[PDB]
Design a protein around this ligand. Structure first.
Ligand SMILES: NC(=O)c1cccnc1
Ligand SMILES: NC(=O)c1cccnc1
Ligand SMILES: [Cl-]
Ligand SMILES: [Cl-]
Ligand SMILES: [Cl-]
Lengths: 470, 469
């Protein structure tokens, strides 16, 4: 079972001996520091961490002894604070004496604002606030996935609106293909759930169970998929039988959308000759609700999309929509699922617009770009101590390195408020107590071992909506 | 965990897409050739034991998967009968055979690393069901490989500036626990770094190694006391010296790392460490040095300036190679901005300024464990052989626009060449015995792990040539 005493950076085991004597409070905060610009971030994922790792009885006699034995060997010395952990076990039945206040999940907040704060509720546990930094800072990942996915939704919305005049289908425009490309099963669920804040199409099944267990949705599931081929199900037929594979697959899934990877040997031949001529009669008979979705999967992503569209536009009837953009028939669509990240997504939709193709014709799949090619440094996610009480006196604490002004941290007790113009401001040095800015938007979400406020996944999705959708 | 729900959604529909009367699907993993010329094979044994062995199918898991997929596809496409067959015939144990190169082996790109096939013809669809779970081995492979490439740089420069490799296994410390995407990732990645090094702050790696691999020693990796910004800045800006004095005094007999850049790294080194607290530093033992930690600024420029400051305040020697050496009670650790590229820049810049690599160690977090993708080594799983209507067919993909994506054909095997290198033979040609015996070993068969490696063996396998020589 998970042991929170073994879930921190090793150096944090020694910090209880390093804080100033007579310190009764350590208060810390998380922000996406100010430095695609990523001007605003979606706050998402803390509730998972609170429930899975922090709530309830998280200390036991056995976990304390386990940690003591490991740290004796790992440091080659006795430095582990057995007394302080045993105090939590005896005093609070192993429940953490910590209070966490957070902006509501799904909220979209400009960079450089407090998103959550952490402090100890018992003076003996001044060391506990930053013990749990390592666990809590991992919220950078769902925040960053949700934010990067939302920024891709903004690009798709802009170009869909310009080329088609509406946003129909926007939710299914970016599909999660990243289960194989992430570092672990646990990451797959967390990252897939973060993408589902913005979209409804996913093949990363792990995200469904996470949302069900930790957030919840009114609908039975938060994300959906369609039948689709992979190279094994095409190439297993033999190279001379690609047409037989395509025919078998489309026939098998005649009444539902079906995606068919078309680049096993020659994507351009497959489009022009196999789909275009040999099997055309099985495509033009398809329903609007069950289109054939052609999937290239190699080559330069923009050049390949444009050439596939040109081929299909010569072999199938093409209409011009009311915005002047070309539109394939409703039984035929394309999905580009190779090489897609926020930068290439932008390149593809702009190149399509230039060649007068509607964004209605295309959807995207993204794997490593969506869930793996992201780091804590993208949004400068950081956790720092801003306030301590020593000898009964509160002092404002901060770092301000000489070589990097971007690393300067906030001072004192913090609160988050709406400005007069409707923007956001973080008040420092306890100035929120003056009440000149209205109510603090941070709410207590965890106190003394209990999750005190929770959000459904439906609420999170509403909070994370685009302005354009609004 | 439910393996029925641990695959890409499209794989649920693949059983209906393969040719009728297919009795075998055989697939393989490789790090495709596209510098990262060789890869450390590591991490499959974790996956086999945690996710694939034993009774992995139950009546409840089938029902759960059926109910989820009905909603997720808005259709009934899930292969309930195929999963029930595994439950009834094999007590829920997977009828799969996996063959793999030994863990820790260092293998050039473009070679077969493992193969997967079904052992019952009814379960032809199962080989690629488990692609998604197995391909996640890219992550420990890639962490281990990139960590080993950093070890090669450190060893080259340490040998050149000092004449030996003493301390090499402590020169790159894992600072990545907070900067990875999950607790599970932290343990996997930290364990892969520990194939090459012994210093880590990512505690999760220790229990994973103990549980799935094992070591003769009580633990596979080690740490030392170290400060963070909160334990310095909590004293107040005017009391940085008091924090430093308290911390070094608290850990007088062991090595201690003290982050020194909260306000002005250069003042801290020159005035606080250099003058005010110098008496507390020059009294320390060689086994308990003060390790000064810058954490901001341009990494190379900051390291060089810190060393210049310290060389003017403390007694520097010249080692037998002609390089400058701080006294043994004083060292530096650069733990900001370190990845494989900046590590190379710093050691080369130090060498140019005549500073021994003995003076420095590195801490890497995101660069070590998170800033890596499956595309770095082109880790890829593909079907190469099927049997349909009783006839074996060699299968592959060969996309026109990308020759790099061409996959291997037929049944595969891994061999030594006459010159001692590796070669992957295709099309069953290993059976001709012109190249000796296949180097892959069966590691999983019909629900059981059949061959395994300790962490100590993996470390031996992953050693550098320079270390071996
Ligand atoms: N459904 C798909 O086409 C898919 C899913 C996951 C990875 N690659 C492709
Ligand atoms: N030990 C350290 O200095 C450390 C550990 C993890 C992250 N950053 C620094
Ligand atoms: Cl207990
Ligand atoms: Cl695929
Ligand atoms: Cl730190």
């Amino acid at each position: 079972e998970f042991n929170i005493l073994l879930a921190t950076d090793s150096y944090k085991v020694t910090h209880y001996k390093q804080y100033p004597p007579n310190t009764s409070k350590v208060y810390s905060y998380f922000e996406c520091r100010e430095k695609v610009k990523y001007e605003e971030t979606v706050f998402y994922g803390l509730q998972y961490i609170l429930n899975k790792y922090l709530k309830g009885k998280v200390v036991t006699k056995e976990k304390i002894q386990e940690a003591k034995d490991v740290y004796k060997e790992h440091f080659q010395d006795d430095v582990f604070n057995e007394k302080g952990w045993n105090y939590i076990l005896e005093k609070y039945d192993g429940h953490l004496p910590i209070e966490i206040k957070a902006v509501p999940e799904g909220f979209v907040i400009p960079r450089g604002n407090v998103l959550f704060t952490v402090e100890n509720t018992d003076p003996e546990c001044y060391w506990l606030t930053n013990w749990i930094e390592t666990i809590l800072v991992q919220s950078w990942y769902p925040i960053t996935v949700a934010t990067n996915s939302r920024e891709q939704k903004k690009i798709l919305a802009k170009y869909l609106l310009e080329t088609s005049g509406n946003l129909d289908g926007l939710e299914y425009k970016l599909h999660d293909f990243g289960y194989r490309g992430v570092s672990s099963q646990e990451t797959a669920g967390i990252g897939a759930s973060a993408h589902l804040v913005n979209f409804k199409g996913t093949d990363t099944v792990a995200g469904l169970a996470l949302i069900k267990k930790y957030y919840g949705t009114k609908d039975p599931v938060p994300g959906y998929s369609v039948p689709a081929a992979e190279h094994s199900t095409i190439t297993a037929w033999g190279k001379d039988h690609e047409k037989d594979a395509f025919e078998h697959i489309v026939t098998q899934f005649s009444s539902v959308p079906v995606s068919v990877v078309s680049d096993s040997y020659d994507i351009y031949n497959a489009c022009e000759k196999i789909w275009g001529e040999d099997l055309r009669h099985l495509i033009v008979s398809r329903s609007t609700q069950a289109p054939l979705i052609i999937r290239p999967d190699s080559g330069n992503p923009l050049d390949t999309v444009l050439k596939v569209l040109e081929i299909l536009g010569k072999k199938f009837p093409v209409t011009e929509n009311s915005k002047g953009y070309k539109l394939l028939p409703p039984y035929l669509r394309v999905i580009q699922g190779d090489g897609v990240d926020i930068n290439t997504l932008q390149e593809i939709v702009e190149g399509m617009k230039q060649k007068m193709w509607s964004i209605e014709n295309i959807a995207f799949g993204s794997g490593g770009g969506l869930l793996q090619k992201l780091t804590r440094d993208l949004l400068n996610c950081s956790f720092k101590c801003s306030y301590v009480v020593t000898n009964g006196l509160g002092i404002n604490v901060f770092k301000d390195p000489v070589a990097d002004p971007n690393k300067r941290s906030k001072k004192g007790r913090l609160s988050l408020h709406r400005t007069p113009a409707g923007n956001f401001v973080t008040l420092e040095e306890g100035k929120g107590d003056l009440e000149e800015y209205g109510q603090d938007l941070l709410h207590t979400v965890f106190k003394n071992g209990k999750v005190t406020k929770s959000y459904s996944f439906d609420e999170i999705r509403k909070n994370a909506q685009l302005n354009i959708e609004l």
